[PDB]
Scaffold this active site. Structure first.
Site, PDB file in Angstrom:
ATOM      1  N   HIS A 161       2.223  -3.125  10.608  1.00 34.52           N
ATOM      2  CA  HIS A 161       2.597  -4.769  10.186  1.00 34.52           C
ATOM      3  C   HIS A 161       3.572  -5.613  11.137  1.00 34.52           C
ATOM      4  CE1 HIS A 161       1.714  -2.100   6.786  1.00 34.52           C
ATOM      5  NE2 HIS A 161       0.920  -3.161   6.161  1.00 34.52           N
TER       6      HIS A 161
ATOM      7  N   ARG B 229      -9.855   2.312  -0.838  1.00 35.07           N
ATOM      8  CA  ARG B 229      -8.447   2.429  -0.680  1.00 35.07           C
ATOM      9  C   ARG B 229      -8.208   3.155  -2.152  1.00 35.07           C
ATOM     10  NH1 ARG B 229      -5.227   0.398   2.878  1.00 35.07           N
ATOM     11  NH2 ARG B 229      -6.150  -1.094   4.459  1.00 35.07           N
TER      12      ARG B 229
ATOM     13  N   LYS C 145       0.677   5.687  14.994  1.00 35.65           N
ATOM     14  CA  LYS C 145       0.122   7.232  14.349  1.00 35.65           C
ATOM     15  C   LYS C 145       0.796   8.396  15.188  1.00 35.65           C
ATOM     16  CE  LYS C 145      -3.609  10.009  13.379  1.00 35.65           C
ATOM     17  NZ  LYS C 145      -3.294  10.252  12.033  1.00 35.65           N
ATOM     18  N   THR C 146       1.734   9.123  14.559  1.00 34.61           N
ATOM     19  CA  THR C 146       2.040  10.283  14.968  1.00 34.61           C
ATOM     20  C   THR C 146       1.740  11.505  14.413  1.00 34.61           C
ATOM     21  OG1 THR C 146       3.965  10.300  13.773  1.00 34.61           O
ATOM     22  CG2 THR C 146       4.303   8.991  15.581  1.00 34.61           C
TER      23      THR C 146
ATOM     24  N   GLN D 171      -7.414 -13.119  -1.650  1.00 38.23           N
ATOM     25  CA  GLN D 171      -6.841 -13.450  -0.215  1.00 38.23           C
ATOM     26  C   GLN D 171      -7.055 -14.979   0.100  1.00 38.23           C
ATOM     27  OE1 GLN D 171      -6.193 -10.920   2.874  1.00 38.23           O
ATOM     28  NE2 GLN D 171      -5.747 -12.420   4.413  1.00 38.23           N
TER      29      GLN D 171
ATOM     30  N   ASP E 275      -7.923  -7.565  11.920  1.00 40.74           N
ATOM     31  CA  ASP E 275      -8.955  -7.185  10.936  1.00 40.74           C
ATOM     32  C   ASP E 275      -9.005  -8.319   9.780  1.00 40.74           C
ATOM     33  OD1 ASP E 275      -6.415  -6.520  10.128  1.00 40.74           O
ATOM     34  OD2 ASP E 275      -7.158  -5.059   8.772  1.00 40.74           O
TER      35      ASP E 275
ATOM     36  N   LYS F  81     -12.367  -0.837   6.995  1.00 41.93           N
ATOM     37  CA  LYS F  81     -11.990   0.635   6.519  1.00 41.93           C
ATOM     38  C   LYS F  81     -13.208   1.435   6.010  1.00 41.93           C
ATOM     39  CE  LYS F  81      -7.595   0.010   6.826  1.00 41.93           C
ATOM     40  NZ  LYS F  81      -6.622   0.697   7.537  1.00 41.93           N
TER      41      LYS F  81
ATOM     42  N   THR G 113       0.800  -1.118  -0.006  1.00 38.05           N
ATOM     43  CA  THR G 113      -0.138  -0.156  -0.092  1.00 38.05           C
ATOM     44  C   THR G 113       1.092   1.234   0.055  1.00 38.05           C
ATOM     45  OG1 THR G 113      -0.019  -0.075   2.515  1.00 38.05           O
ATOM     46  CG2 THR G 113      -2.015  -1.146   1.106  1.00 38.05           C
TER      47      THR G 113
ATOM     48  N   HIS H 275       4.890  -0.557   8.175  1.00 40.27           N
ATOM     49  CA  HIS H 275       5.154   0.179   9.065  1.00 40.27           C
ATOM     50  C   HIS H 275       4.717  -0.622  10.304  1.00 40.27           C
ATOM     51  CE1 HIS H 275       0.775   0.396   8.849  1.00 40.27           C
ATOM     52  NE2 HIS H 275       0.729   0.892   7.747  1.00 40.27           N
TER      53      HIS H 275
ATOM     54  N   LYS I 244      -4.699   5.883  18.406  1.00 39.89           N
ATOM     55  CA  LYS I 244      -4.260   4.714  17.532  1.00 39.89           C
ATOM     56  C   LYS I 244      -2.780   4.613  17.551  1.00 39.89           C
ATOM     57  CE  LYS I 244      -3.867   3.494  12.361  1.00 39.89           C
ATOM     58  NZ  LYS I 244      -4.619   2.639  12.698  1.00 39.89           N
TER      59      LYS I 244
END
Ligand SMILES: N[C@@H](Cc1ccc(O)cc1)C(=O)O
Ligand SMILES: N[C@@H](Cc1ccc(O)cc1)C(=O)O
Lengths: 322, 322
Positions: free
Chosen positions: B51, B89, B238-239, B179, B200, B85, B43, B48, B235
């Site tokens: 994962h 996407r 997340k920054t 998948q 998820d 989501k 993606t 990140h 979250k």
């Protein structure tokens, strides 16, 4: 902008169930000859009476000066149209469907004029574009334009998703996209701006109209013919021996002629309008004639003669009396 | 039949959200080393922190003697996983995703041992089988095994189909099938009998279990890791500057180390279990140590040191102090 009377004339014969933007379509038809199309899937090695009304309608349009495109579903016939069907359609092999496509294409040809100038008919096969299309390309380039919430709301498949006594495979759920792209493809290649089809095809047709707009920014139209019904409520074209095929080797011209002779008085005049090219004036006069003749109605004999000739030609009509 | 304690041990660390037939899986794990897999989609040009837990879990399994298969979604990354989501996407080009796949594959490699005998890791890419698959073949051979009524009921997409303030394209609705087939394919090729993934991914994983049964008559299993959360409800990973990438060129080792040092006291001990290979005994002793030391907790420093080394090696750990 002038307005064509072709749609009104078809309405007179009771051949118009639904039509998109009738006023705009009638105006477009008046602008000049347009290319239109109707598709037929190879669910068997021959078409049957269920396919006849739409097939003859292509000819009615050609008679008015328009150009008919007869598409045979080399690809869609490998998927199966679930529209208003209770259960999944049988999946046939690629090898077998390929042969059926060839037989159906040849069966359709005689019904249209492929040698009458610019409005000469064209034969098409959606396998041309789906037979070698990669799955990711389909899901992205075509699939991105389809909303599942909308697809689930199509009346054609509502039952399959609501009735707990049935369901629908992802295979058949995807059919709508294939027929939808077919319309866009024919528009792009041949300038097809109208698709006609049976009563159960409305949703597949409108998906084609929307996708053509989304992909090519062109406004195209759709028209469906009504469900052919019999006064006694039974299914038209269905007999104890199965369907009434257009293939002489499956249903002989003699047997075909006999099927029409058996038409009920209640349906015969309506059927003359659906299945023949006799004028409305002539048919109305015939009904009045039978009404006050005191003799057996000649409508059944006229209907049998007319359709048998359209389907099997003079030879078939002759074979019907031997 | 002996029972492995690997699942119980992962549970101790709080790394097990859901698991299919835990008793049967534990028994299979005891029979001998198995091949398992987890997939990661391109993606972006790097993975990140989101994962990381699943990635490290592949290693936890390899440490137990099992063989990890790290799949990078060359094809699925061209579709997009809608699971839990809110919106569609972005669709990326084939050319770009292909390059991202290569970068991600290389980024994943150092995390697993590809040279430790029969349980050596294997790199996979579903583009191998979807990149040249015809659409009709997919819709028929794979699509026939999927019920739309069932697909619509998957919790992962329920919101997209229920909330009037959103919807889902046919493109993303089809992801589950891709998948799903991935699991069947890896089972057939490498004997993969277990798929692990983020919280998820349950529905995508079970579709794979069912399809593997339908296509190959083999019983396979699934296990998901929990949603990584922070006590303050925000979250994880997340920054203000975006995500915390595993790529040193996107997020420097120094910045990476700083992210962990900033871990809240409420989350640090839990994070030590999720992100490091320290024993539960050692972590529990560390928490007690910080509880009665009267000094600054050393948990954050230990966590930062541990993960930074796992992600950027000794060099990255050294760069974190310069
Ligand atoms: N779906 C139509 C056949 C068809 C196939 C392809 C098309 O593009 C249009 C129509 C039927 O079931 O009769
Ligand atoms: N769907 C997973 C990635 C994945 C891709 C392919 C698989 O076979 C498995 C997992 C995710 O979004 O993280």
């Amino acid at each position: 902008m002038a307005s064509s009377n072709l749609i009104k004339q078809l309405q007179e014969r009771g051949l118009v169930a639904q039509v998109t933007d009738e006023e705009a379509l009638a105006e477009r038809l008046a602008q000049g000859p347009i290319a239109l199309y109707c598709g037929f899937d190879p669910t068997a090695d021959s078409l049957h009476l269920g396919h006849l009304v739409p097939l003859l309608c292509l000819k009615r349009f050609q008679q008015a000066g328009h150009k008919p495109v007869a598409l045979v579903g080399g690809a869609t016939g490998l998927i199966g149209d679930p529209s208003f069907k209770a259960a999944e359609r049988k999946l046939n092999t690629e090898e077998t469907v390929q042969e059926w496509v060839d037989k159906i294409r040849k069966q359709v040809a005689p019904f249209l004029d492929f040698d009458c100038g610019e409005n000469s008919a064209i034969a098409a096969n959606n396998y041309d574009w789906f037979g070698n299309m990669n799955v990711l390309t389909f899901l992205r380039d075509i699939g991105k334009h389809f909303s599942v919430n909308q697809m689930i709301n199509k009346e054609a498949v509502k039952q399959r998703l609501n009735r707990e006594d049935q369901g629908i495979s992802f295979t058949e759920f995807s059919y709508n996209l294939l027929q939808g792209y077919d319309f866009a493809c024919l528009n792009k290649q041949y300038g097809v701006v109208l698709q006609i089809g049976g009563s159960d095809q409305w949703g597949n047709i409108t998906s084609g109209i929307d996708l053509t707009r989304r992909l090519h920014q062109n406004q195209v139209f759709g028209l469906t013919v009504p469900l052919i019904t019999k006064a006694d409520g039974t299914k038209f074209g269905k007999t104890e021996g199965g369907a009434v095929w257009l293939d002489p080797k499956k249903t002989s011209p003699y047997k075909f002629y006999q099927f029409w002779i058996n038409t009920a008085d209640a349906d015969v005049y309506r059927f003359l309008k659906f299945f023949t090219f006799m004028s409305i004036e002539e048919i109305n006069a015939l009904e009045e004639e039978d009404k006050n003749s005191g003799k057996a109605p000649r409508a059944q004999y006229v209907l049998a003669e007319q359709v048998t000739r359209l389907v099997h030609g003079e030879e078939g009509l002759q074979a019907a009396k031997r």
